[PDB]
Design an enzyme around this catalytic site. Structure first.
Site, PDB file in Angstrom:
ATOM      1  N   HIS A  48       0.818  -1.192   0.000  1.00  0.00           N
ATOM      2  CA  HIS A  48       0.000   0.000   0.000  1.00  0.00           C
ATOM      3  C   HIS A  48       0.858   1.251   0.000  1.00  0.00           C
ATOM      4  CE1 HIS A  48      -4.196   0.860   0.548  1.00  0.00           C
ATOM      5  NE2 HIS A  48      -3.916   1.855   1.421  1.00  0.00           N
ATOM      6  N   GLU A  85       0.370 -34.035  -5.380  1.00  0.00           N
ATOM      7  CA  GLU A  85      -0.712 -33.331  -6.042  1.00  0.00           C
ATOM      8  C   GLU A  85      -0.168 -32.503  -7.196  1.00  0.00           C
ATOM      9  OE1 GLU A  85      -4.116 -34.069  -5.336  1.00  0.00           O
ATOM     10  OE2 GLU A  85      -4.490 -32.396  -3.934  1.00  0.00           O
ATOM     11  N   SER A 104      -0.623  -0.359  -6.390  1.00  0.00           N
ATOM     12  CA  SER A 104      -0.518  -1.416  -7.374  1.00  0.00           C
ATOM     13  C   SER A 104       0.305  -0.929  -8.555  1.00  0.00           C
ATOM     14  CB  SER A 104      -1.866  -1.820  -7.840  1.00  0.00           C
ATOM     15  OG  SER A 104      -2.501  -2.605  -6.850  1.00  0.00           O
ATOM     16  N   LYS A 123     -15.582  -4.941 -11.283  1.00  0.00           N
ATOM     17  CA  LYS A 123     -14.760  -5.701 -12.212  1.00  0.00           C
ATOM     18  C   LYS A 123     -14.365  -7.034 -11.587  1.00  0.00           C
ATOM     19  CE  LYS A 123     -10.900  -5.351 -15.482  1.00  0.00           C
ATOM     20  NZ  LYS A 123     -10.068  -4.387 -16.245  1.00  0.00           N
ATOM     21  N   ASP A 124     -14.197  -7.059 -10.255  1.00  0.00           N
ATOM     22  CA  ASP A 124     -13.851  -8.284  -9.545  1.00  0.00           C
ATOM     23  C   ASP A 124     -15.022  -9.259  -9.567  1.00  0.00           C
ATOM     24  OD1 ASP A 124     -11.082  -7.740  -9.029  1.00  0.00           O
ATOM     25  OD2 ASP A 124     -11.537  -6.804  -7.066  1.00  0.00           O
TER      26      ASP A 124
END
Ligand SMILES: CCCCCCCCCCCCCCCCCC(=O)OC[C@H](COP(=O)([O-])OCC(O)COP(=O)([O-])OC[C@@H](COC(=O)CCCCCCCCCCCCCCCCC)OC(=O)CCCCCCCCCCCCCCCCC)OC(=O)CCCCCCCCCCCCCCCCC
Ligand SMILES: CCCCCCCCCCCCCCCCCC(=O)OC[C@H](COP(=O)([O-])OCC(O)COP(=O)([O-])OC[C@@H](COC(=O)CCCCCCCCCCCCCCCCC)OC(=O)CCCCCCCCCCCCCCCCC)OC(=O)CCCCCCCCCCCCCCCCC
Ligand SMILES: CCCCCCCCCCCCCCCCCC(=O)OC[C@H](COP(=O)([O-])OCC[N+](C)(C)C)OC(=O)CCCCCCCCCCCCCCCCC
Ligand SMILES: CCCCCCCCCCCCCCCCCC(=O)OC[C@H](COP(=O)([O-])OCC[N+](C)(C)C)OC(=O)CCCCCCCCCCCCCCCCC
Ligand SMILES: CCCCCCCCCCCCCCCCCCCC(=O)O[C@H](COC(=O)CCCCCCCCCCCCCC)COP(=O)(O)OCCN
Ligand code: HEC
Ligand code: HEC
Ligand code: HEM
Ligand code: HEM
Ligand code: HEM
Ligand code: HEM
Lengths: 244, 54, 85, 383, 383, 244
Positions: D202, D272, D206, D228-229
């Protein structure tokens, strides 16, 4: 690895339950239970299935209580603390043919017949593997295969040498619904039954998935409209630059 | 159609009440509709279809 | 390195005029057909090589390796397998 | 002053989810962060629910999972949801790390969120490995055996440490009960680190797909990235639905439906799917200890990206050569994944080693060289 | 600029534990906050360790606790430490709440940390109740039975909710397994709320025993309160030692060493000592639902202290009448505790009701009256 | 409640293990095991104690292996899957006199003799309660007490009527160390043994506590010096105020 060591991979048969919207054929399930009961149950347990699980899948409550009540199960000790037996109830699990592993192996020339409650999930191929294996004993092993004693040749089994002999032959079962009990029919039915045993939620799961797919699809479509709607001020933004 | 906006949409209290009442109706009808659809595409397969024999 | 609203840390801006319209005043799907066809084709064409080259190479590599491996574990491949071990 | 700014608690929420200034040009690959948060929430909810029905004792564990499948209302869904979301968690985490590598999110000033992220990735691996053991099927047991035996490689103390992990001389009840406790815990530790990497981020904000400053043009996190998410949330849920409802066992190993049997060893013991590339890297080195170090180094080497990337430009959007190199790196990582699950046979032995060399040489040789050359091409090219 | 201030993560730590400006005159009752943090850390460490050895299945639970006592290395210590620290956690929490009430920490501007604190107190109660059930001794079972039956009082849906909590028609395996999962979880939720109430407090800073501003005279949290906190840490550890090593069962009920038996009902079903005052309040009301409401209200009424305290002065240091009233309130709370464990017999029935009336009348009548009168006495008294 | 309903509260006897620095007397523990084995074990189990637990407390490895090897325990089935017995090992738990609750109750006129592994922790009073109860059967119940059939009067037991009869009488045990086996001696020994059974860590716990007390005391003393040292600038601070 050699193909032999892997086992031949089973064909993809068109099971009624293949298909996003398809349930099991319950008539086939019922027939398959009768094959389990008359053939496989001699050697194989179905320990994770209770009598109550058959009710409203393959049998009515009454038929299943009848099956339970024919058997004796361990009760709580009596008042002198001596062991007692009771007749079975719907909550009881379908009992196995052998008391322990050692007894099972002794009866099968050292091989231990696995519990079949999960076998459709526990092998690559599922129903197709069970069907292929039960139907896939050749009359004669391919020339040059050396079977260990008490082994039978079956190409679908990894390594080829399986401790279980061929057991389905035309008319070992007499189906109560008049269906001709051919090797192929019985294998299909029992394979369907075992698939149900491994995943009993199957029918409900696929129906809820249909509802989920529909709701989530609509929400996805709407979320796209809403995103575009809210973003249009930013996408549509225009600039005029006058250098100062 | 102004009328429709004014009654059901303008006040958020009314809009949220409308959405929840619609969700109630949708939930009940969608359940019933899928049940019938599922029974038609899986006809003669399900326990309810063979139960009558017993 | 980043501030907050009102002191974000931009160099001074002067002389950029920014215009936009309300979401209610715009068509949210204006020119969607043109974009979905022509714009997507343009963007895909411009990036195609950067995906196709590595994918095709590594798929070819895997294909060759899996085919050799399969062949080594046949009858025909017995001798070549014996040498490979 | 508005309450969401005035009140200290609300203001912390506000600063992260509402007024948070974001670049106005984030593309869909910036949506993996929120998908990972959604996976983490699904895993907490389903995981805590399974914990209400699961029994950690080795005599009952496998059967308790069958009880969940068969007896508990919607147990099948909660179990499959938890198991499949573990796969989606890794798809999303690889996508998120891929985004970060391609767009140079690891460069200054974002080295700290990147580096904390590398630890989150390790915790996810440990969490998912322990969770797998809890089923106590054949793969659970044999996977635990083989992976915990890697610690035997640590010189002098290795054997003692393995017995200490196991609580025993083999994988058994003590191991299972301890993995239950830790598997429950580790996701909370992971959530704390996930929060730390956000707090670290922060300070810089971003990055964005152009790799330039966004200080010139910011957009509130809500409503723009909120809505948008949602698109990727619903796209994710559609993929989740197709697995959980229609093919719940496509990502699974059948052998895990056979109860653990220390006598019978399964045909092939593979981890896995999401751990397979690291497993291929381990097999590549012939030495036991070498293999383990290489496997750990394959993760820890991500920590040197901030140093070895010599570019004056952030990220790959404008760097054709770096984009090609990145494409090859990603495809090689997938080939490693594939070679992790083949049998140790020709010709995959040599191939696995070549892919492992390519994996390491990306960080150590190619990225430093290519980034240096492109610097020069941009300068000479624009003169 | 110094790193501890520059780096955002370090700066958060710095702001809470190092440069945090504290009043220079905090007395030893300001040390309970850190002791509670120490209890919380001990409970997490011992609890997670017990979880590695405990089995949640009702067929094995009691025996797994015996296994911890008898077989696990230092299991006795970890078990007793966890059990005794649960008692110390409540001693410290009552001390902390007592400090806050006496010194008016609940007044503006600290209503929010106070109110979040009331929720922490409820979570602690739930956590400790569920943890007690996990032993699955006689008191575990019968305590769960009677406490969960209180929910039956909720009209219309009460019975259905109880069956839902139990996962069954009585307390048994499903209840035990779910309490294990939730008991594991609840301390993490409690830690989050504890952190929230600190963040809320950080806007006003700690109150001080004079109830005046400390803005005029501050001290760094470290080293002064760091080293002052050590004294109570070692005093606490001495008390911890005397219980855990020398009298580990003094705070325990013997009946919890008998395995749960749904048939045999124990002589006297009482909660753990720290819940006894609330139990006395419940018994005081004859009506089932009334009793439950009163019991909850006895905790939730703390939320109205900010309103009912009408004083113009913060805290009791200078208020002789308020100090006397507070003394009686505290001693009454202890009497309620005692009456929580007596038999429902004369003359304790009537006495329990009188103490309950005194408990509520403190918040509703006496504190508002006394605080109003003292306001007037300070004004007239200083003219 | 009436005193009767509570039971008379047992005296505080000076046990060797009372006292912050005191261990159990292991010679008494050994004697007490012999009382358990020859008297109580007829009715009461000690299920949480394994043979290995006696080793290096009351018995050597050899003595305890001898005790284990005298008994038969359930083995894994043989190769035909038939049940088998094996001789006991140190890892085995001391076996109970009855196979289940029902058998136990049938042998004790309906009362169930509790397992004694935890009984010292599970009753108010601990060792003192066990000692008082075993020694506290009066010759005659106080006049006016009506005992239910198969109950015996014992004032220490709540309600007074206990299903266990007096069992310790002078010379029911012959101690191997030549100690006179009086009722009181045997009760003291067995009560000590049972206290050990309930809390076998007791001796180690108290020693570690001594170490902890010492270290923590010193740290507390030093923390006070250090606090005072660091705080002295603040305590010693002086002001001069000149109003501006
Ligand atoms: C998993 C959970 C499910 C949830 C879904 C999340 C996935 C969303 C995501 O991040 O990817 C969509 C993502 C769309 O993101 P976007 O915001 O339109 O553009 C991001 C790039 O800048 C787009 O790059 P561009 O603007 O250069 O356009 C490139 C793209 C065209 O992009 C599209 O619009 C599709 O076409 C290709 O690169 C295709 C390669 C050629 C193959 C033949 O699609 C791609 O970019 C696919 C290319 C990846 C390689
Ligand atoms: C539990 C875990 C163990 C950890 C221990 C932590 C406890 C420490 C604590 O908060 O209390 C010590 C605390 C010493 O704290 P301090 O910072 O020296 O003074 C706090 C008072 O506000 C200062 O009060 P003051 O200056 O008015 O002194 C009052 C105190 C005298 O305080 C003395 O220490 C002497 O004497 C009494 O109130 C005794 C009442 C008369 C009985 C006869 O002891 C008390 O003053 C207890 C009075 C409570 C009634
Ligand atoms: C498979 C191989 C992928 C190579 C991608 C090459 C770039 C490309 O064409 O992608 C489209 C786009 C190109 O976008 P762009 O941002 O470079 O360009 C946008 C358009 N211009 C240049 C005009 C501004 O790339 C991405 O969006 C890449 C994200 C990478 C995610 C990788 C996940 C892999 C997991 C491995 C983890 C270890
Ligand atoms: C038991 C009865 C206690 C009554 C206290 C009355 C004040 C007193 O004498 O205390 C000494 C001291 C007096 O300190 P003080 O700060 O008022 O005065 C210091 C000295 N002068 C006045 C010169 C500035 O009080 C405290 O320190 C009180 C803390 C209260 C803690 C209560 C815990 C009880 C748990 C109940 C939970 C619900
Ligand atoms: C936790 C796991 C998250 C994954 C959710 C996806 C589907 C799971 C829902 C269960 C399910 O099968 O529901 C079906 C419908 O799906 C649906 O319609 C659900 C899809 C909706 C997507 C997510 C929307 C919100 C979900 C998360 C919010 C939860 C907390 C907020 C209050 C049909 O089941 P049914 O219709 O028979 O059910 C009875 C009511 N008639
Ligand atoms: C009298 C013995 C016997 C009968 C009858 C029998 N089986 Fe088996 N079965 C075995 C034994 C033994 C094995 C183990 C073979 C081995 O591991 O070599 C086995 C193995 C299997 C396997 C798993 C093979 C694998 O991949 O491990 C399936 C599935 C199976 N049986 C299903 C059936 C079905 C369905 C029937 C009858 C309808 C049936 N069996 C009848 C003895 C029997
Ligand atoms: C032949 C029977 C029998 C013998 C011998 C016996 N007991 Fe008991 N004991 C019982 C029965 C029955 C009860 C249950 C009494 C009841 O609940 O009314 C009991 C109860 C007890 C209790 C707990 C009483 C309570 O508070 O619940 C203790 C302690 C006890 N016995 C210890 C011993 C010791 C020590 C010995 C011998 C050294 C011993 N017992 C010998 C049958 C016996
Ligand atoms: C639980 C796992 C994780 C969660 C929930 C998570 C979440 C997020 C979120 C929400 C963001 C901001 C929005 C975004 O860019 O997508 C973000 C950014 C970031 N994450 Fe993660 N993350 C996780 C794991 C990781 C890992 C494993 C790494 C690195 C190895 C990482 C490195 C980063 C970096 C460097 C950024 C800044 C990227 C940028 O915006 O330019 N994270 N993360
Ligand atoms: C990052 C979060 C998590 C991941 C990646 C994760 C991963 C996994 C995985 C891979 C399994 C094996 C699933 C299977 O094949 O059946 C599993 C099982 C399990 N997990 Fe988790 N898990 C997470 C969080 C949690 C949490 C918070 C709990 C809380 C207790 C939990 C409880 C369980 C339980 C009880 C099982 C065993 C039952 C089962 O197999 O389904 N998990 N987990
Ligand atoms: C896990 C439980 C808790 C922890 C770890 C905790 C911790 C702390 C700490 C470290 C402080 C600052 C130093 C101090 O004054 O002692 C504090 C202050 C405070 N706590 Fe707590 N607390 C807890 C529970 C509670 C509860 C239950 C309440 C209220 C019902 C509460 C209300 C407050 C208030 C009002 C303050 C400010 C007091 C002041 O400095 O004047 N806390 N707490
Ligand atoms: C505030 C934190 C906690 C409190 C107040 C608390 C309280 C308690 C209490 C009162 C008991 C009953 C103890 C007994 O008499 O034997 C208990 C048992 C237990 N607690 Fe906790 N606990 C806490 C945190 C945790 C945590 C984080 C775990 C992690 C799993 C945990 C695991 C257990 C386990 C396994 C038991 C059962 C074994 C036993 O009785 O000792 N506890 N807890």
């Amino acid at each position: 690895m050699t193909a032999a060591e892997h086992g031949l991979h089973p064909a993809e048969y068109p099971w009624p339950q293949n298909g996003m919207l398809s349930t099991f054929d319950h008539a086939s399930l019922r027939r398959g239970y009768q094959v389990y009961k008359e053939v496989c149950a001699a050697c194989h347990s179905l320990d994770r299935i209770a009598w109550r699980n058959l009710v409203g899948v393959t049998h009515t409550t009454d038929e299943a209580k009848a099956f339970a009540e024919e058997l004796e199960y361990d009760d709580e000790p009596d008042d002198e603390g001596n062991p007692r037996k009771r007749p079975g109830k719907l909550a009881d699990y379908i009992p196995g043919p052998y008391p322990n592993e050692q007894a099972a192996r002794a009866a099968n020339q050292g091989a231990l017949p696995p519990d079949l409650s999960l076998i459709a999930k526990a092998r690559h191929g599922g129903a197709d593997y069970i069907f292929a294996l039960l139907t896939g004993y050749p009359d004669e092993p391919p020339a040059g295969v050396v079977l260990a004693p008490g082994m039978n040749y079956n190409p679908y089994f990894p390594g080829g040498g399986i401790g279980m002999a061929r057991t389905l032959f035309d008319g070992v079962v007499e189906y109560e619904d008049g269906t001709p009990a051919t090797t192929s029919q019985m294998a299909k039915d029992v394979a369907a039954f075992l698939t149900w045993a491994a995943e009993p939620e199957h029918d409900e799961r696929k129906k809820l998935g249909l509802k989920a797919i529909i709701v989530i699809s609509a929400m996805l479509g709407l979320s796209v409209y809403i995103k575009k709607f809210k973003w249009s001020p930013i996408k549509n933004r225009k600039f005029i630059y006058n250098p100062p | 159609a102004t009328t429709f906006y004014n009654v059901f949409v303008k006040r958020n209290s009314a809009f949220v009440a409308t959405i929840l009442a619609s969700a109630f109706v949708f939930d009940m009808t969608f359940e019933t509709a899928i049940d019938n659809f599922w029974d038609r595409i899986n006809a003669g397969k399900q326990w309810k279809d063979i139960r009558h024999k017993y | 390195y980043m501030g907050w609203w009102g002191h974000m840390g931009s160099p001074p801006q002067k002389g950029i005029a920014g215009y936009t319209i309300s979401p209610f005043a715009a068509r949210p799907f204006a020119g969607v057909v043109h974009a979905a066809i022509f714009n997507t084709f343009r963007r895909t064409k411009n990036q195609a090589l950067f995906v196709i080259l590595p994918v095709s190479f590594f798929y070819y590599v895997w294909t060759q390796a899996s085919e050799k491996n399969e062949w080594l574990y046949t009858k025909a491949g017995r001798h070549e397998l014996a040498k490979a071990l | 002053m508005a309450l969401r700014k005035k009140n200290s608690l609300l203001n912390m929420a506000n600063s992260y989810v509402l007024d948070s200034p974001q670049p106005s040009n984030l593309n869909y690959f910036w949506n993996f962060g929120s998908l990972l948060a959604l996976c983490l929430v699904i895993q907490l909810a389903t995981g805590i629910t399974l914990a209400m029905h699961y029994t950690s004792h080795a005599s009952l564990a496998f059967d308790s999972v069958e009880h969940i499948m068969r007896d508990v209302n919607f147990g099948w869904f909660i179990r499959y949801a938890h198991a499949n979301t573990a796969s989606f968690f890794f798809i999303c985490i690889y996508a998120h790390m891929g985004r970060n590598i391609y767009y140079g999110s690891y460069k200054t000033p974002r080295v700290l969120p990147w580096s904390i992220g590398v630890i989150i990735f390790l915790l996810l691996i440990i969490t998912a490995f322990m969770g797998y053991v809890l089923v106590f099927g054949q793969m659970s047991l044999w996977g635990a055996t083989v992976i915990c035996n890697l610690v035997s490689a640590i010189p002098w103390l290795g054997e003692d440490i393995v017995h200490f992990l196991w609580g025993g001389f083999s994988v058994g009840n003590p191991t299972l009960q301890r993995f239950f406790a830790l598997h429950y815990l580790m996701p909370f530790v992971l959530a704390v680190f996930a929060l730390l990497h956000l707090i670290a981020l922060h300070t810089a904000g971003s990055s964005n797909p152009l790799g330039i400053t966004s200080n010139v043009d910011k957009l509130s996190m809500h409503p723009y990235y909120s809505f948008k998410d949602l698109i990727t949330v619903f796209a994710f849920l559609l993929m989740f639905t197709l697995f959980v409802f229609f093919s719940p066992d496509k990502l699974g190993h059948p052998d895990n439906y056979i109860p653990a049997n220390p006598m019978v060893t399964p045909a092939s013991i593979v981890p896995e799917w999401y751990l397979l590339p690291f497993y291929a890297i381990l097999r590549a080195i012939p030495d036991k200890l070498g293999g383990v170090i290489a496997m750990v180094a394959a993760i820890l080497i991500l920590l040197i990206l901030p140093i070895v990337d010599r570019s004056i430009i952030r990220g790959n959007a404008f760097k054709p050569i770096s984009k090609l190199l990145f494409g090859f790196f990603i495809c090689n990582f997938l080939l490693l994944g594939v070679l992790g699950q083949v049998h140790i046979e020709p010709p995959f032995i040599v191939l696995g080693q070549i892919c492992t060399i390519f994996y390491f040489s990306y960080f150590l040789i190619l990225l430093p060289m290519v980034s240096t050359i492109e610097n020069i091409f941009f300068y000479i090219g624009s003169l």
